[PDB]
Amino acid sequence: MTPSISKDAPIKGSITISKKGATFTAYKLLDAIKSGDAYEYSVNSDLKDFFNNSNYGSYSQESIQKLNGEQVKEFAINLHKYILENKKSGQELKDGQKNTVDLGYYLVTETSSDSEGAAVASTPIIVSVPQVSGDSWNYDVTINPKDNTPILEKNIVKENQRVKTSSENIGDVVKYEVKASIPVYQKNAQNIMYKFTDTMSKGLTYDEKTGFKVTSGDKVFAKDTDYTVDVKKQEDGSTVITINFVYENIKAYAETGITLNYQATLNKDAVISNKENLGNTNNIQLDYTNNPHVKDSYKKLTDKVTTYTFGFGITKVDSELNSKLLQGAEFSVKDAGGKIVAKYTYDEKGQVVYLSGNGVTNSKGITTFLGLKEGKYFITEEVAPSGYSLLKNPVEVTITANKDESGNYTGAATIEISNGNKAGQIINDISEKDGNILFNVQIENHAGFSLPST
């Protein structure tokens, strides 16, 4: 039993819909016409053909009045299929506005290719104007889009925590975890894109053996059936990894989303510095379908983490003459705990090569120890340069990593002698031609001297 129609009722109504950047289209299926104390319906000519059509659910006019919750959604789809299938035009509804429409029965769909934010396209809506509210009619109706908004994050997994930034020794692993939503669409939707693009900077080597573990809550997904993995080495050194999904296989797992577990190893080509820098990055991008019925309608979510490392050179000099540079002196570097680290050094050319033993001082008295995270390290003179005594104690250094208000590494760092060995002293940073920047520990050696005989 419909409510009574006021003598002051307007001839036109309105549809207000709120979704920024989006455009909706209203298709009038029935005109509402007043007779006595009720609204009667007569079909729109243009959409007359939808009625009693085989490949559209073959709906009659007398079938709309009685329809189930789902039978309405089905009806909506069919009607949408017809509109698209026969390239039917409609009225465009602008956002955040009162849209004046004729009284009747509408299908409303999101028809714009793009929209603000991350949300995918709204599902097709069936609305009438006016619509019943208690003992009256509401001629100014509102519709809130039927859509979802996906999220994406990338995190480094360090010590059972999730951080946007970290520090490691070259040769060690950086574990990555990606959390992402699985967007949902209507059922009559095809050619859905769900595709990750991960970019690792040259300092990171993707661990191809471990690979990707693709997971939705408890479900483990299968490579080459649910997704492909595509790894391409770039000319600049970076690695682009594309994980393209068969959306149909993850469709039913939207509740728990997608988790990606994978790792890289920080390599000898890493960014080594003590200034604020971009570091050794991992970028993840997710490209997904926005509106499944408008060609080339896609959106994009991005996130990124970075890993930093540091290093120091040793300038070996004479005790009395700091000007004199000592060659052939050999040094070992141990961390706190006594284990040997910094198994990478600079070439006589400027290339980063493996360091299989002690660091031997240049003809300019220099050796470099690369790929060290912040902490306390012990520099020990293993072999003295020809004609010199041996340092009786290690030169202890402590590297301190700069952090930001949020507690994230910035890539900047400082270093100091932390055991008070006066044989050592922090001098000017070494700037490599490849862009790297090293700390510089100058260490003095005492030359032997013979005493006069009669």
Automatic annotation (TrEMBL):
Q: Does the keyword Iron apply?
A: no
Q: Which residues form the SpaA-like prealbumin fold domain?
A: 312-404
Can you name this protein? Probable surface protein
Q: What's a Pfam family this protein contains?
A: GramPos_pilinBB
Q: Which organism is it from?
A: Clostridium perfringens (strain 13 / Type A)
Question: For the Gram-positive pilin backbone subunit 2 Cna-B-like domain, which residue ranges apply?
Answer: 170-292
Q: Which keywords belong to this entry?
A: Membrane, Signal, Transmembrane, Transmembrane helix
